Design an enzyme around this catalytic site. Structure first.
Site, short mmCIF file in Angstrom:
data_model
loop_
_atom_site.label_atom_id
_atom_site.label_comp_id
_atom_site.label_asym_id
_atom_site.label_seq_id
_atom_site.Cartn_x
_atom_site.Cartn_y
_atom_site.Cartn_z
CG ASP A 1 59.51 40.50 40.39
OD1 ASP A 1 59.43 40.24 41.61
OD2 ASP A 1 58.99 39.80 39.50
CB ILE A 2 57.60 43.20 44.82
CG1 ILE A 2 57.59 43.92 46.17
CG2 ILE A 2 57.03 41.79 44.94
CD1 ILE A 2 56.20 44.19 46.70
CG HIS B 1 54.18 38.13 34.27
ND1 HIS B 1 53.10 37.33 34.56
CD2 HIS B 1 55.24 37.58 34.92
CE1 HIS B 1 53.49 36.33 35.33
NE2 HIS B 1 54.78 36.46 35.56
CD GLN C 1 50.75 32.37 34.24
OE1 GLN C 1 50.64 31.39 33.51
NE2 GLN C 1 50.19 33.54 33.95
CB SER C 2 52.92 33.19 41.17
OG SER C 2 53.55 34.42 40.87
#
Ligand SMILES: Nc1nc2c(ncn2[C@@H]2O[C@H](COC(=O)NCc3ccccc3)[C@@H](O)[C@H]2O)c(=O)[nH]1
Ligand SMILES: [Cl-]
Lengths: 115, 112
Positions: A32-33, A101, A95-96
Site C-alpha cells: 500500500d502506497i 481488496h 472504501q476509497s
C-alpha cells in the site's frame, strides 16, 4: 481492458507501477502506497468486482484465495507476531477504491476497535 | 483446544444467532464495537488464519459471502468493515477463526 480502469485495474495490467509481493492467475499482492502499519499490503482479485456487497456466490473460492494468499505473503514478510486483515465496504466502511481488496497490516500492535 | 466459540456452535451457551448453515454460524458479538457488530465463524475448528489449509479456500470465501448477505439483511446499506485478526499483533481474541463485520457508524482509518 481486463480489470477495469480503477488504479487497481491499471496496476493489474502493469500500466501503473506497484511494489508487487506475489502474483498468480487469480490475484495480485502489492504494498500500500499509504501504509498504516510498518507492513501494509493489499491482495486484490484480477477479476474486477467493485465491492464485496456485489460479489456473487460463485466468487467464494476467489475471495477465500485472497485470504490464503494474504496469510502466505504475511508469513513470507516475517509477520511472525500476527497481523490484521480488513475489507472495507462502501462509505461507512471507508472504501476509497471500488475494486475489491484485502488489506493486510502488521509489524506493530493493532488496536481495538478496528477503526 | 476448545474455545467459547466451540461452545456457541454446539449450542451449549447462548448467543444471538443471525444465520446458520451446515458449515458456518453468524451471531452478534457480545462486546460490540459498532451499532451492528457480528461474527461469522466456520464450524470447522481452524484455530487461526495463519494455519488455514489451501482446501479451506472456498469455506473462507463462504464466510465472506455469508457476512455480506447478513450485513444487507441487517440494514447496513451505507457500508461496513470486515476484519480477521491473527495472533497477538492482530489482537486475535479467540483461537477459532472468525470474521468480524462492523457497521452502522463511520469506520475510521487506520483500522486500529
Ligand atoms: N500501491 C498503491 N496503493 C494505492 C494506490 N492508490 C490507492 N492505494 C491504496 O488503496 C487503498 C484503498 O483503501 C480503501 O479503499 N480504503 C482505505 C482508506 C483509504 C483512504 C482513506 C481512508 C481509508 C488505500 O489504502 C490506498 O493507499 C496506488 O496507486 N498504489
Ligand atoms: Cl479477534
Amino acid at each position: 481492458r481486463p480489470g477495469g480502469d480503477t488504479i487497481f485495474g491499471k496496476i493489474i495490467r502493469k500500466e501503473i507501477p506497484a511494489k508487487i509481493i506475489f502474483e498468480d492467475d487469480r490475484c495480485l499482492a502489492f504494498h500500500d502506497i499509504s501504509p498504516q502499519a510498518p507492513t501494509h499490503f493489499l491482495v486484490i482479485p484480477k477479476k474486477h468486482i467493485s465491492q464485496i456487497s456485489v460479489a456473487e456466490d460463485d466468487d467464494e473460492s476467489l475471495l477465500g484465495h485472497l485470504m490464503i494468499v494474504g496469510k502466505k505473503c504475511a508469513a513470507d514478510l516475517g509477520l511472525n507476531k500476527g497481523y490484521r486483515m480488513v475489507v472495507n465496504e462502501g462509505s461507512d466502511g471507508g472504501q476509497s477504491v471500488y475494486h475489491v481488496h484485502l488489506h493486510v497490516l502488521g509489524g506493530r500492535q493493532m488496536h481495538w476497535p478496528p477503526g
